[PDB]
From a paper:
Since all previous structures of ND1p97Lng proteins were solved using pathogenic p97 mutants, the solution of this wild-type ND1p97Lng structure has confirmed that the deviation from a perfect hexameric association of the ND1p97Lng is not a consequence of pathogenic mutations but is caused by the D1-D2 linker. In the structures of ND1p97Lng (residues 1–481) with ADP bound, the polypeptide chains could only be traced up to residue S462, indicating that the D1-D2 linker is largely disordered, which is consistent with the random loop observed in the structures of FLp97. We superposed one subunit (subunit A) of the hexameric wild-type ND1p97Shrt with the equivalent subunit in the wild-type hexameric ND1p97Lng. Whereas subunits A of the two hexamers align well (rms deviation over 426 residues = 0.65 Å), all the other subunits are out of alignment, as the ND1p97Lng hexamer ring is out of the plane of the ND1p97Shrt ring. Although this misalignment does not necessarily mean a lack of proper six-fold symmetry for the ND1p97Lng hexamer, which we shall define more precisely in the next section, it is an indication that the D1-D2 linker alters interactions between neighboring subunits. Although different domains or sub-domains have different Asym Index values, on average, the ADP-bound forms, for both full-length and N-D1 fragments with the D1-D2 linker, display the greatest deviation from proper six-fold symmetry, which is in agreement with previous observations on full-length p9723. By contrast, in all structures containing the D1-D2 linker, the electron densities for the side-chain of R359 is absent in all subunits in the asymmetric unit, indicating this residue becomes disordered in the presence of the D1-D2 linker. To reiterate, the multi-structure alignment of ND1p97Shrt with ND1p97Lng and FLp97, all in the ADP bound form, showed significant misalignment of the adjacent subunits leading to a side chain displacement of R359 that cannot be ignored (>3 Å). In this paper, we show that one such element might be the linker connecting the D1- and D2-domain.
Residue numbers in the entry:
A (entry chain B): 21 to 458
B (entry chain A): 246 to 460
C (entry chain C): 21 to 245
Amino acid sequence: NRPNRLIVDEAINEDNSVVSLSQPKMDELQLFRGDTVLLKGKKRREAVCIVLSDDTCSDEKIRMNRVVRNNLRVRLGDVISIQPCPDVKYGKRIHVLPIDDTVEGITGNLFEVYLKPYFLEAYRPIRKGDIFLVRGGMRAVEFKVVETDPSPYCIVAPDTVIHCEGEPIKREDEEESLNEVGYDDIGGCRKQLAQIKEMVELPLRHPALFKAIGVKPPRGILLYGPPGTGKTLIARAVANETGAFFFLINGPEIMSKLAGESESNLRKAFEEAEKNAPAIIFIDELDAIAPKREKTHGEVERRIVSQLLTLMDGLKQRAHVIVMAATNRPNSIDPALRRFGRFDREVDIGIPDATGRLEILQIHTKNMKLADDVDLEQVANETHGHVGADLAALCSEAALQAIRKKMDLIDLEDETIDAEVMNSLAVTMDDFRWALSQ
Amino acid sequence: PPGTGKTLIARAVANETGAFFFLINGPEIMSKLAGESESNLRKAFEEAEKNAPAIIFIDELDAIAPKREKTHGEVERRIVSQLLTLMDGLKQRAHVIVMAATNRPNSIDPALRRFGRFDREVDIGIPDATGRLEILQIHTKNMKLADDVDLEQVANETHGHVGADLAALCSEAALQAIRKKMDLIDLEDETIDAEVMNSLAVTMDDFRWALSQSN
Amino acid sequence: NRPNRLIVDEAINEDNSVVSLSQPKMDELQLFRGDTVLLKGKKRREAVCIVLSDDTCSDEKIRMNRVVRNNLRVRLGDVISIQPCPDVKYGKRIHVLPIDDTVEGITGNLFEVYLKPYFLEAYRPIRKGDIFLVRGGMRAVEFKVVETDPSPYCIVAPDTVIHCEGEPIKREDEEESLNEVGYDDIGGCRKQLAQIKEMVELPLRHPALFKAIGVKPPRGILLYG
Ligand SMILES: Nc1ncnc2c1ncn2[C@@H]1O[C@H](COP(=O)(O)OP(=O)(O)O)[C@@H](O)[C@H]1O
Ligand SMILES: Nc1ncnc2c1ncn2[C@@H]1O[C@H](COP(=O)(O)OP(=O)(O)O)[C@@H](O)[C@H]1O
């Protein structure tokens, strides 16, 4: 009895201007694959998009990517209205400008470098006030649409004139950076990723539920696993992606403080994260603060260990605050914390398998011109047992290996580099092959 | 073992025999400043004799009173004795009782079991199946369960779970129902009336799920 | 489309007054083995040198040693211009002086001890304002050229009078000590030495790159052993 409302869920097709429904739901709203749909959302906000069928997608849900949700002002698991839009006319004029903080650095002709291959032969449906993302020149450029000739909303057919005029613009207060971290930056471990959300879904997203029912959320979540395996990442993702307030407790950064002033921080950390709730408090490197008491030869070394557990209990359910933690192994840390009062919930962010490796390889190659011979599938399948820092630097150094060759050539020119010089810069399977020796 | 119902039983007994209850939460003391740690520990007793007959309950005793081999510390140990002073300063006739909870006998200082103070020691072990079932029942008591919900089965498969394990198992299996009906409610967009809640059923497939989650 | 510009790379012949190109690059600039070449570099700076063929050397690159690069004001991997110089006349007078901090200690006749066996039968191309290094007497002596009779630049043939006159001189602000440590002081481990440079090449040498690209350098390097 509310058909056109829908839930928001992950993109499987990560093109900017494509949303995906189930096959029934298209039959329900009398929509056709390829039709331009219009979606409305919070803060009076509209986006226009191309609809497609997804066999996997649940009837209730709609798959879309950050670019989209951003202009709608929603986060994952929110609700929006979708209605057809076969009244959209081809555009004559589009006045697009870049957001200054995605362009400080690269120089040259954005019109040519990013906009041209993006819009080319796509017939994209845009809208006055959209914010979109282009991937090249070893970075991402964010563009806002200031005016279109068929206002508000128009299609971009080959015919369309694209006004690149003048200034890079400043970022508005509530428009988040598509540069910022999110789930689409994560790879390999999908299972765990879910388990996290669903625990944290209700208390973060529907915080007023738990004052109204006697039931209790998680308070604490712990992250197992090898180092650099995406722990610090996932956490910052989840908060940014569920719009939660984020406060970081960087283990060593506390232990570096003066005695007692260590605790003084640890309080204010919580104290603030209850003021700005619903919140994640994230403890990176927990074994730096809370090791097994056998390891704690120290009065003040231990004073903190308890000081934590005090605040971890002083944490109300109804404060709707959650604490996530990251350590290197369970044995590292004090057992008391896994007392089913505080860090009851414990996730094994392990290693990637080949499919996961591949996924991650993809995630860092996303802003680079790869050559046709580049076979990431291969790269993954031989790199048994690599974490997503391993695989991420593997990219970085294989890119730097291409930059070195073209760099010799550039040095003869002696010129600093325009984006255009960057866009022409290819990365090869022999540039990868190399970074493998490391 | 931890979360086995120790902190529970204690607060039950006091509420159920109308005794005055004062809680000494181990870490909560050790989190204090040196000496102000002791200053509390006195007032704790001092008050519990004023409000007698009373149970003074020490949750997580191994936090305050570990084996002296573990107590590399002057003030870490100063407290350990400060307890034993008050445990003796406890009159019989004060009709006050102290209950304590630790994770294992080896955890704690042997002196306390000196037949002066903690002479009496109870083994709150794990549940058997019948006990599990009992506990499952105890947290399902405010929820509409579906006819297919067979707690008997749940208990019977869940070998070796403590009553925190089994209690959260419920909580998350309920949250798992709340999620589905929650999708549906989100379309309404309404916050929830009790009436909405009363209609909210919990299923064996809602339970089945919360089983994947491990402890 | 800029042929005469070249990259700077390690010396394989560590004689002071010899630079080495590839065999194609000599055919490209129409240079002959033994020809006196003139090289220009940053801060208005010139050096003059003898060119040779190196089979190993990459066409793009030029092999030279610290003595050289110093007077050019460049470090490894920089760019310079090389042009022939068959107009260099034999020298009559050369007014050379030592730099005080490479001579406090040793006493005696520098003219005889260091300059004489150095210049002997070499036909070295020097230049007014060059800084060169001599190896003997259990140390290294650094000499600056204050004036030459065919100014600015001249060859040193047996005929040449070498004026050793007077004072040791102080070091100028930007002229680094060739006494100072460098790669030519290193031995054995060649592989590692490369691996280091290349990591540290881009961020140290081209530091404004990494504000302009999302890619990241190394931050830390550790040394086992
Ligand atoms: N699965 C992954 N997907 C994408 N990036 C990853 C992944 N795993 C690791 N990374 C990269 O490596 C780094 C991971 O470090 P992090 O999770 O912060 O670990 P830790 O706290 O374990 O040191 C991140 O900066 C990220 O760019
Ligand atoms: N036998 C049981 N019957 C009912 N509930 C239990 C039982 N054992 C544990 N629980 C539940 O789990 C928690 C037990 O925690 P607690 O007794 O405080 O453990 P500890 O002091 O052992 O950490 C309680 O909050 C309670 O709801």
